[PDB]
Design an enzyme around this catalytic site. Structure first.
Site, PDB file in Angstrom:
ATOM      1  N   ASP A  89      31.914  70.310  -2.863  1.00 23.04           N
ATOM      2  CA  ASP A  89      30.847  69.824  -2.016  1.00 23.04           C
ATOM      3  C   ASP A  89      31.127  69.879  -0.518  1.00 23.04           C
ATOM      4  O   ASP A  89      31.751  68.966   0.036  1.00 23.04           O
ATOM      5  CB  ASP A  89      30.562  68.385  -2.453  1.00 23.04           C
ATOM      6  CG  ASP A  89      29.319  67.764  -1.878  1.00 23.04           C
ATOM      7  OD1 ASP A  89      28.695  68.387  -0.968  1.00 23.04           O
ATOM      8  OD2 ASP A  89      28.923  66.706  -2.372  1.00 23.04           O
ATOM      9  N   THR A  90      30.588  70.916   0.167  1.00 26.37           N
ATOM     10  CA  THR A  90      30.800  71.036   1.614  1.00 26.37           C
ATOM     11  C   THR A  90      30.100  69.950   2.436  1.00 26.37           C
ATOM     12  O   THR A  90      30.475  69.749   3.597  1.00 26.37           O
ATOM     13  CB  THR A  90      30.381  72.418   2.102  1.00 26.37           C
ATOM     14  OG1 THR A  90      28.998  72.593   1.804  1.00 26.37           O
ATOM     15  CG2 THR A  90      31.193  73.522   1.414  1.00 26.37           C
ATOM     16  N   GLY A  91      29.117  69.263   1.840  1.00 27.48           N
ATOM     17  CA  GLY A  91      28.400  68.186   2.526  1.00 27.48           C
ATOM     18  C   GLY A  91      29.108  66.847   2.439  1.00 27.48           C
ATOM     19  O   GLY A  91      28.643  65.859   3.024  1.00 27.48           O
TER      20      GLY A  91
END
Ligand SMILES: CC(C)(C)[C@H]1Cc2cc(F)ccc2S(=O)(=O)N(C[C@@H](O)[C@H](Cc2ccccc2)NC(=O)O[C@H]2CCOC2)C1
Ligand SMILES: [Cl-]
Ligand SMILES: [Cl-]
Lengths: 99, 99
Positions: free
Chosen positions: A25-27
């Site tokens: 998850d880059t967020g």
């Protein structure tokens, strides 16, 4: 590997000798895992998501293998809907976004 | 481009003639933007994350420009703390995770 995003980017992780499924998850600034036992002392932390801020347990210097890549860092434990691998550990495995 | 993950992967987007800052988020299935007006019909939707659920308005067939790349898809509008570009639009710009 190169992972496309047509489906959720789910990978196998290994933590405390157990295999689990987790989302790359880059967020997410931080890594958050569903309830489990981890060694050592923990510190309090609040993480804010789409529905607001929530309480988790912060464990530091935890050994975790992500899609076969070894990482050692902070793991948050709490009532997350899914296991999330956040930027603190994605950087350790050399993960980048490309287009 | 190649985007590293030492900091949040924030980019400029253009939607409904407005420039906004948004997060490239592989952990988000859908794109969710802070309150704004969009053209056409909408339907209500509930989206869940860390902290629970929020109610949003679902707009379909909306054009967004992300880093100069044009993409079309569903855009959710509601009380999100940050503008999120989710997988439905990341796939359209050919975004992948690499390690
Ligand atoms: C449940 C899951 C499938 C993963 C996701 C559910 C989801 C599904 C969607 F279609 C759209 C949006 C979202 S979401 O937005 O709910 N979200 C995406 C995460 O990347 C958020 C984004 C975000 C960032 C900042 C403020 C609000 C939201 N990060 C997060 O919770 O970080 C926290 C988690 C750890 O680090 C800090 C979690
Ligand atoms: Cl879509
Ligand atoms: Cl593709």
């Amino acid at each position: 590997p190169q992972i496309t995003l047509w489906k959720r980017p789910l990978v196998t992780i290994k933590i405390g000798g157990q295999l689990k499924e987790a989302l790359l998850d880059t967020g997410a600034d931080d890594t958050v895992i569903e309830e489990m036992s981890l060694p050592g002392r923990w510190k309090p932390k609040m993480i804010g998501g789409i529905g607001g801020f929530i309480k988790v347990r912060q464990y530091d210097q935890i050994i975790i293998e992500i899609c076969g890549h070894k990482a050692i860092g902070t793991v948050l434990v709490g009532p997350t809907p899914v296991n999330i691998i956040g930027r603190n550990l994605l950087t350790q495995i050399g993960c980048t976004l490309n287009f």
